[PDB]
């Protein structure tokens, strides 16, 4: 059973701007997703400070980067607080409507796409490099769900019957044909060292056979 939703007009406009604008500095997508993961890890850590049972779904707080050249996917896994179904539908837990409004004024007032994260909509920079994005998520207060969009104005949400996650979020980037450099180990290492050197959680770059 799959539910199909329309993006809010303002979010559809944000996504088409990211996809259509000529902008060479695409590598910032990874900084933005890692920062989102760090934010989600901060949230579950804070909750566990007064309620240790919040970590019964997993004590380890970490970020994994998993390239797969056969599937042409880059997966960013974190064990953060995760998202409920309501969070997923409500623009993946963001205030994307007002964030987009602010972001798009900044773009006409000088800024560039790389500054997207300051407006709370950094997730959508995934469409700089991905033709399709799948988000698998598990929050302590809900079931495991899969969100998916190839842009084009709609997304789907379904109950996820795949591998149970315990707690957290998995962003699966189905990369564009000309963006496979972000599956190469030395390119990912360079980007993490350049933009994410001070993230306070272990970032593990998986290797392939
Ligand atoms: N807001 C707004 C419009 C805008 O320029 N968005 C944009 C464009 C290219 C890349 C990114 Cl990451 C974002």
UniProtKB/Swiss-Prot annotation:
Gene: HSP90AA1
Localization of this protein: Nucleus; Cytoplasm; Melanosome; Cell membrane
Residue numbers carrying N6-acetyllysine: 43, 69
Location of region: Interaction with NR3C1: 1-209
Binding annotation for ATP: 36, 78, 97, 123
Segment of the intact protein contained: 16 to 224 of 732
The organism's place on the tree of life at top rank: Eukaryota
Recorded domain comment: The TPR repeat-binding motif mediates interaction with TPR repeat-containing proteins like the co-chaperone STUB1.
Assembly, per entry: Homodimer. Identified in NR3C1/GCR steroid receptor-chaperone complexes formed at least by NR3C1, HSP90AA1 and a variety of proteins containing TPR repeats such as FKBP4, FKBP5, PPID, PPP5C or STIP1. Forms a complex containing HSP90AA1, TSC1 and TSC2; TSC1 is required to recruit TCS2 to the complex. The closed form interacts (via the middle domain and TPR repeat-binding motif) with co-chaperone TSC1 (via C-terminus). Interacts with TOM34. Interacts with TERT; the interaction, together with PTGES3, is required for correct assembly and stabilization of the TERT holoenzyme complex. (Microbial infection) Interacts with herpes simplex virus 1 protein US11; this interaction inhibits TBK1-induced interferon production.
Name of the protein in question: Heat shock protein HSP 90-alpha
Family statement drawn from the similarity comment of this UniProt entry: Belongs to the heat shock protein 90 family.
Modifications made to the protein after synthesis: ISGylated. S-nitrosylated; negatively regulates the ATPase activity and the activation of eNOS by HSP90AA1.
Organism the protein comes from: Homo sapiens (Human)
TM segment ranges: none
Function per UniProt: Molecular chaperone that promotes the maturation, structural maintenance and proper regulation of specific target proteins involved for instance in cell cycle control and signal transduction. Undergoes a functional cycle that is linked to its ATPase activity which is essential for its chaperone activity. This cycle probably induces conformational changes in the client proteins, thereby causing their activation. Interacts dynamically with various co-chaperones that modulate its substrate recognition, ATPase cycle and chaperone function.
């Amino acid at each position: 059973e799959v539910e199909t939703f329309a993006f809010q007009a303002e979010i559809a406009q944000l996504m088409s701007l990211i996809i259509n604008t000529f902008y060479s500095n695409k590598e910032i997508f990874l900084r933005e997703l890692i920062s989102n993961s760090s934010d989600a890890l901060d949230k579950i850590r804070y909750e566990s400070l007064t309620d240790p049972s919040k970590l019964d779904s997993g004590k380890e707080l970490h970020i994994n980067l998993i390239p797969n050249k056969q599937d042409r996917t880059l997966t960013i896994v974190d064990t953060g607080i995760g998202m409920t179904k309501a969070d997923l539908i409500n623009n993946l837990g963001t205030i994307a409507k007002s964030g987009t409004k602010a972001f798009m004024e900044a773009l006409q007032a000088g800024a560039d796409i790389s500054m997207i994260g300051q407006f709370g909509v950094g997730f959508y920079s995934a469409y700089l490099v991905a033709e399709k994005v799948t988000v698998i998520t598990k929050h302590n207060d809900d079931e495991q769900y899969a969100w998916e969009s190839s842009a084009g104005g709609s997304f789907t949400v379904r109950t996820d019957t795949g591998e149970p996650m315990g707690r957290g979020t998995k962003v699966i980037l189905h990369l564009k044909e000309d963006q496979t450099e972000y599956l190469e180990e030395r390119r990912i290492k360079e980007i993490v060292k350049k933009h994410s050197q001070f993230i306070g959680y272990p970032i593990t770059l998986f290797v392939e056979k």
